[PDB]
Structure formats: structure tokens, C-alpha cells
Curated annotation (Swiss-Prot), chains A, B:
UniProt topological domain (Extracellular) ranges: 1-89
PTM comment text: Not glycosylated.
Substitution effect: K75E: No effect on integrin binding
Organism whose genome encodes this protein: Homo sapiens (Human)
Protein family according to the UniProt entry: Belongs to the tetraspanin (TM4SF) family.
Protein name: CD81 antigen
Residues under site feature: Important for interaction with integrin: K4, K32, K36
Purpose: Structural component of specialized membrane microdomains known as tetraspanin-enriched microdomains (TERMs), which act as platforms for receptor clustering and signaling. Essential for trafficking and compartmentalization of CD19 receptor on the surface of activated B cells. Upon initial encounter with microbial pathogens, enables the assembly of CD19-CR2/CD21 and B cell receptor (BCR) complexes at signaling TERMs, lowering the threshold dose of antigen required to trigger B cell clonal expansion and antibody production. (Microbial infection) Acts as a receptor for hepatitis C virus (HCV) in hepatocytes. Association with CLDN1 and the CLDN1-CD81 receptor complex is essential for HCV entry into host cell.
Subunit structure: Homodimer. Part of a complex composed of CD19, CR2/CD21, CD81 and IFITM1/CD225 in the membrane of mature B cells. Interacts (via the second extracellular domain) with CD19; this interaction is initiated early during biosynthesis in the ER and enables trafficking of only properly folded CD19. Part of a complex that includes MHC class II/HLA-DR molecules and IFITM1. Interacts with IFITM1. Interacts with IFITM2 and IFITM3. Part of integrin-tetraspanin complex composed of CD9, CD81, beta-1 and beta-2 integrins in the membrane of monocyte/macrophages. (Microbial infection) Plays a critical role in HCV attachment and/or cell entry by interacting with HCV E1/E2 glycoproteins heterodimer.
Domain notes: Binds cholesterol in a cavity lined by the transmembrane spans.
Effect seen on changing F14A: No effect on integrin binding
């Protein structure tokens, strides 16, 4: 068995760490490539509306190839889209 | 540092489980839904492991097309895609 709520938290935490590492002392490319991948796949750019916004302003590269800024204001954030994926509500 | 491998292993299992469930419609429990989402989000259909379960879902229209070569011609499996998500690959 595998717990649905639990595994959403696991993935969510996992993305947080990489976002957190990808935004600071970059040069990683690693946490940066997982962040870009998470962002293109789930169509989001922050653990929250605030961080997505921020991120789009300070580090646009990490956001979906064609996302914008304003959009990040209204479009769901990665944490929502992760829950959506685990409850098959996409 | 929630373990990348370990998380990736759990998401595989979680997908397998939804998989072992969208086959028996009886209270589909969005198991079908969960499957469909993973399939559209990660762009995959089933696993090389689990060939039977795969044949079943594909036949039950849980791996929709809409293109050409992937469009249900050359699948790509969810365990690989999931691995790719957690490694910032594709």
C-alpha cells in the first residue's frame, strides 16, 4: 500500500527543496533542471502564488516556456497541481 | 532530503495501484480518473511491467490519443516518465 495524502506531501516537499535550492545559490542546474521539469509538466512556478510570482520576476527561466507574470497571479500553484495529479482531478 | 529514489518508487507504486483498480469499474473511485490524469500529464500509458493491466486500460479508453506516433502508436511507459519527472530529465 501507499498512502495518497502522504505521498502528495512527499512529492510536495521534494519539490520545495529543489525550488528552494534552485532559487538561491544557483549553479546547481540539478535542482534547477527538476524545477524546470516540474514547472513544464505541471504548468506552475512556485510552491505558492507568491513564490511563483517572485520566481517569474527574478528567475523567469525556471517557469513554463511560455508562462507570463500576471498569469502566475491567478493560475494555480505547483502545490495545487500536485494535489490535482494525485486525485486525478486534472 | 526526502529520498529522490524513494519518492520515485512510491509514485510508481501509487500509479500501479491506481492501475490495479481502474480495471475493475466497480466504484471506479477516480482510480480511473487518477490513471487518466497521470496518462495525460506525464504522457504515458501503462508500464512494461504490468503488460496485462496495460492492455486492459488501453482498451478501456484510459490512454486517449490525439496526434500520430505516440497517439497510441508508441506508448512510453509511466514508470519511465515518472523517473524522468523526479530527475529533471524530460
Amino acid at each position: 500500500f501507499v498512502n495518497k495524502d502522504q505521498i502528495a506531501k512527499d512529492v510536495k516537499q521534494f519539490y520545495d527543496q529543489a525550488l528552494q535550492q534552485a532559487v538561491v545559490d544557483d549553479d546547481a542546474n540539478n535542482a534547477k533542471a527538476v524545477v524546470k521539469t516540474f514547472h513544464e509538466t505541471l504548468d506552475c512556478c512556485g510552491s505558492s502564488t507568491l513564490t511563483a510570482l517572485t520566481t517569474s520576476v527574478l528567475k523567469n527561466n525556471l517557469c513554463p516556456s511560455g508562462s507570463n507574470i500576471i498569469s502566475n497571479l491567478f493560475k494555480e500553484d505547483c502545490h495545487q497541481k500536485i494535489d490535482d495529479l494525485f486525485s486525478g482531478k486534472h
